[PDB]
Amino acid sequence: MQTVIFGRSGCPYSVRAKDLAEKLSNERDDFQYQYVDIRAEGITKEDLQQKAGKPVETVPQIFVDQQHIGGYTDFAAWVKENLDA
């Protein structure tokens, strides 16, 4: 499992979304987590929405096993569908 995060270093809710993946990475051995800047790196929600195939407006901006999965919102609901299911 590979989970990739676009822009931690820029806002607290994006950090919380990153931290959720890192927290899961702490909890298990299957689950690997990756952080990539967008505000530093010169990337934006206009780039991310094209790559993802879906018009995005705001954060979070996460991908799981190379696929777009929102982040803190999607990820909490996804984690819940496993651990609270």
Partner: peptide
């Protein structure tokens, strides 16, 4: 006159899925 602008918080910090935050470059 001379004032400060403050935001009240009725909800708790509960960790479960806020979908937005307008963050970028």
């Amino acid at each position: 006159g001379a004032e400060d602008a403050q935001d009240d918080l009725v909800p708790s910090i509960q960790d479960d899925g806020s979908e937005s935050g307008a963050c970028k470059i």
